[PDB]
Amino acid sequence: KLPAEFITRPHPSKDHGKETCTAYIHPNVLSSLEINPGSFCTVGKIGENGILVIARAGDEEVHPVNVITLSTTIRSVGNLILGDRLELKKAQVQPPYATKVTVGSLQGYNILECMEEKVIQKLLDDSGVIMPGMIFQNLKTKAGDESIDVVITDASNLFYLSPPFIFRKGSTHITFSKETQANRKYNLPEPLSYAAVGGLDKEIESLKSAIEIPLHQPTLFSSFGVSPPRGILLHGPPGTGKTMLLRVVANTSNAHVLTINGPSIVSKYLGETEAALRDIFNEARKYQPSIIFIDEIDSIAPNRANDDSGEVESRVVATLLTLMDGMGAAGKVVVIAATNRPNSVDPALRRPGRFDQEVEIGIPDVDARFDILTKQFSRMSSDRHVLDSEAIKYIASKTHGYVGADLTALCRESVMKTIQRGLGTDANIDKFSLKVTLKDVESAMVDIRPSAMREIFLEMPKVYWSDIGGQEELKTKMKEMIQLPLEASETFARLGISAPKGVLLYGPPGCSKTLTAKALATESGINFLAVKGPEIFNKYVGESERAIREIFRKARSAAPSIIFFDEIDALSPDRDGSSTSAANHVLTSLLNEIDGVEELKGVVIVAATNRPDEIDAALLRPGRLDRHIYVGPPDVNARLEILKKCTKKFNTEESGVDLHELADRTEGYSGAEVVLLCQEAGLAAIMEDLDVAKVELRHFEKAFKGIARGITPEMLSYYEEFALRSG
Amino acid sequence: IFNKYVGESERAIREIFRKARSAAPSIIFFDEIDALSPDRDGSSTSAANHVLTSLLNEIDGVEELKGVVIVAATNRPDEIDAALLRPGRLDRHIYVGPPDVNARLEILKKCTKKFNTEESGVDLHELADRTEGYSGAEVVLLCQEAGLAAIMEDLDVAKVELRHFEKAFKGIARGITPEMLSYYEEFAL
């Protein structure tokens, strides 16, 4: 008999003896493959390149058939975390002598700082089979150094992960350096650490405590008269760093790790999926300091009140409950789960005694994004060129909605942009030499829209504020809501007020409401969602309200956002209430959501309507849409600006068409009519001659004689009465 | 409480009362009760007034002084089906009208707390009377708008001043007197 994939454990000694590069193994494993004690053999994770080590027979009286025990030196090379499955194999080739080698420290010093070379020689002779990555730590210190470590940083591949060598004193030119990593050109795996996670400092502290105490100080807790926590539940929106924390916990917690990532346990055969959970938990008890990760727990522990849950899933939930309760004697196993939708987990698993402890991973704020970007950019400091922390703080300020995955994508796209630009100067430029100037991160932001916004497909032609002629008070009041609350948060805080977060734009048809919406989308800088009501309505009961909840949820997933309710009056029910069963629920849901964002959040709601007084008073009160602005017909200057914007590509100067006279003639026009006048003039010019160069006053006369004034005294009176409905 | 599938709304209401049985004394709060009984009883009585049926059944089962009481709110009083206002059900009514001069001044004092109104000479007793007919939230809004007027003038503000309150006042509009002070005076009768 010969197991397929053996389990890693430590060889109990950590004195850095002669064994530091041996692999204690059960006799049958060596013999069945005809390996012998002292012979070299390969160890590696399933499907990866191998790691060379020295085989050695263990104590069959105690040592199980399935266990291969390695050294902290060997495990450093491949980042073998206690409990991963190894695909051991025999080896047939002897590596040469390490002609050139270097040794350093993970903590950044030179080994020339504390200890003489003799103990270094002895230690690296105990290694024997030299290769990069053999960290070893906790030696004696010649000085009173608070800590120490040593690492073989480089040396000079038969499906091997590291390039192995053999020690031969003197011939192997061993130098010494400040280096902490191993040579990247080898691409040995690198362990993650809590120093890479940024922004989540407090969550990290809580999780570190909750994992430190149960595994490594259980006896202490029990004296306080309560049983220890035994389940932790990480949750939050996708892309915030849960799985990263799970892998960092695996690397940093010196405990045996078992994983159930998704439905990796389900089986064809009727009973065997339960056997999988029971086996995992039994093996976690075998090596009592251990952690079991259940990532994407909702995929295997569904709610069962959601009747979509199958029999397999109910049987899995029942077994997992009886196991979690059955972690008897208050041992040292800790079960950490991660889920982006914790409410889909069966409540039986969140009861006290089950996953009672929960850590919420929130969306980064500006400071959190600054921390994440500083950490991510500190990994590339020699190629950075955005070295100013001011520049990184600018990028953090501009990246509204980025969640932590999006920031890493931003850095990746910045690398790509820098390569594109550099390679644009020479087809064979040294691509490794290019460095990431801020301009390239700014260019990358154009492509990397937040992942929370990928369900918002909108064409959105590009329109700037300068295109919206002569609405200056509207522009100022939109600044006040879109930019000032973000650039002046501290002044609001000290004054003790929240900025208004709703505005209603009303006015005659043609005046720039939707144009202001497009301008906000183009130049607000923050995320933009639009609901073209009555787009939300749906046949089935509850679907119309679920649409409002979903759009407000995505606006809440975007962090700073702008929900533009075009024709909001379509959602406000009718006066007579005739068959408005669905509409009433729609308006109540909309009000409940505007009240949900009313507290603690900074979403801004913009609404545009042509019938200002047919929308419910509950939806116009402050807290709901606060500000009302009358987007009225352009005055003389506004029409002059529109005429310039339109006729700029006409040769007006030589043509002699004086735009001021047009502005005088066009009194009463809406902006749409002023634009149509220019379009009609251009059509007249083109129809007169297909090779037009100039549009001249006869064409504008022709266009003018055909354009009506859609605005009437009645409409203007109505919109100037809406401001006075109170009396 | 409303779901696409058949009968899931009824189950939800009965389950809400079931869970409500858990304690006493206890207030059940039906905000915007007018959107629980909007129609299908007075009109459009086709097949889907079950939610009203269930709620109006439950409202009777609760004992008169066992410990549970029920509070509701509405700004559309006549949209509430008369079935709910039958005595024994919900017949008691309290009017929450626009604040009087002294109430508005208390709101102003609270929401202008960190404004140095004393140093700037912003005499609240002028704002409290100028803001007559301002219904609650609008008194609060007038103070947010004053602050924004202050910040836009010179970011890094120390205090807000009367001219900012003038700018705020000139931009706020009130409610409808043929709908407010009416349709509630009538509902009082």
Ligand SMILES: Nc1ncnc2c1ncn2[C@@H]1O[C@H](COP(=O)(O)OP(=O)(O)OP(O)(O)=S)[C@@H](O)[C@H]1O
């Ligand atoms: N501070 C950080 N927060 C989050 N992600 C970070 C951070 N720093 C770097 N990252 C990277 O962002 C990604 C985070 O991993 P994810 O798997 O996206 O975490 P998660 O998406 O929140 O968990 P899921 O969606 O349930 S698998 C990885 O590619 C990390 O390298």
Ligand SMILES: Nc1ncnc2c1ncn2[C@@H]1O[C@H](COP(=O)(O)OP(=O)(O)OP(O)(O)=S)[C@@H](O)[C@H]1O
């Ligand atoms: N300064 C401006 N003021 C008004 N309209 C302008 C201005 N500049 C351009 N336009 C034109 O305005 C048109 C669109 O105006 P909209 O904002 O969509 O009007 P509207 O408010 O949506 O009217 P409704 O929705 O029917 S009540 C486009 O054809 C623009 O070319």
